[PDB]
Amino acid sequence: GKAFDDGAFTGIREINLSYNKETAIGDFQVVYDLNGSPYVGQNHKSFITGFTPVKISLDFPSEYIMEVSGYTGNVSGYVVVRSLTFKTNKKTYGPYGVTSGTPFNLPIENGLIVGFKGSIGYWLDYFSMYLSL
Amino acid sequence: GKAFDDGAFTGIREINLSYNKETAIGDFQVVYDLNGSPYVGQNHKSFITGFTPVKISLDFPSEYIMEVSGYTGNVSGYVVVRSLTFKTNKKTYGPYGVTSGTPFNLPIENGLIVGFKGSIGYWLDYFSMYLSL
């Protein structure tokens, strides 16, 4: 996969991702907030194409993500993120993809996701999140 | 179960917990650092006996936790924390308990666990961690 690292911002306005229902999460792009202005993040694309695109448009600043969760599993020999769900104080977006494999979740009691990093090959291999008050 | 919330400190010196290889995590207690003095956290005890005690004494400050992981699952009709494992930059402590049910994990690329909170009845029901740079 190709590594990526957006760094840290001041919050999240929009998540653009893609997935396929037989495979996994494909591409990933975030529109951050930067001091109350939109910052259009790099668009991290899979080496292949075919995925169904989704736009998660949050009602910023009142709406924010409280939990990220997903499944990892094996697709044609690759262990990847097969599913993602984003739960905010307002509602749940997802699951997008295939919800089979080993689960993971990052629930947040206090604080904000303010950036993403990770790696994408054919699919989303893994990701980390920057957190801040 | 009975709620506990130790608050936030400067770091972690020692974790004392108990577990049963057929059930789940029981007692939990932490010796934090507070500006260079050990802060002896309240021993948060299970309602029941019969657990095995473990002392995780860390080489503070050069050694620190990088990943907490575990399983959650049924015991007696309750969803509880069935196992924990603590990985530092120096070694791995655990798994302690029963490594069955739903996996979870919190790996940390940057920052420190500085506090625990949660609830313990017969077993560790749930927990959260305070993070700081």
Partner: peptide
């Protein structure tokens, strides 16, 4: 120190 500010990071998930 360096002059780059820092931020808590948690992860990775995705079989690592």
């Amino acid at each position: 120190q360096s002059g780059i500010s820092q931020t808590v990071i948690v992860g990775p998930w995705g079989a690592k």
